[PDB]
Amino acid sequence: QQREAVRQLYKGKKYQPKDLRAKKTRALRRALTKFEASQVTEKQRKKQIAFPQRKYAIKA
């Protein structure tokens, strides 16, 4: 009950108590986040948009 109350006390607030943070592992915690890993420079974004991989089959 106390922990759940504290969770509400820190609901949506950044820099919350560590014990409430994920216990997955040290390596995964320091790993790049989903947003960070998806960061693509404007040049690469334009290149991908212009020439994305196409679906082609050898039929005729």
Binding site: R54, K55, Y56, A57, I58, K59
Partner: protein, 88 residues
């Protein structure tokens, strides 16, 4: 890779044209029909060795003694450097 051979370049161009004419590219807007892929593109375009010569040809000769030509070519390359120095 550089291109310094008309025959090889033409063969590659023909191969590219055949590949382009044999592939179907589905539109990016979806609605792609059944594909029925082929697990090997090289199988559809096997590499073929160009024919070096026909099986039979009419015989023609000049009496040049092709062996003599080879000996002359071998000898000429040996003394070319000495010949050029002797020329002056």
């Amino acid at each position: 890779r550089q291109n310094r051979n008309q025959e090889i370049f033409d063969a590659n161009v023909q191969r590219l044209k055949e590949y382009q004419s044999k592939i179907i590219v589905f539109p990016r807007n979806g609605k792609a029909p059944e594909a029925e892929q082929v697990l090997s593109a090289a199988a559809t375009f096997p590499i073929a060795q160009p024919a070096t010569d026909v099986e039979a040809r009419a015989v023609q000769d000049n009496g040049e003694s092709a062996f003599r030509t080879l000996r002359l070519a071998r000898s000429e390359k040996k003394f070319r450097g000495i010949r050029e120095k002797r020329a002056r």
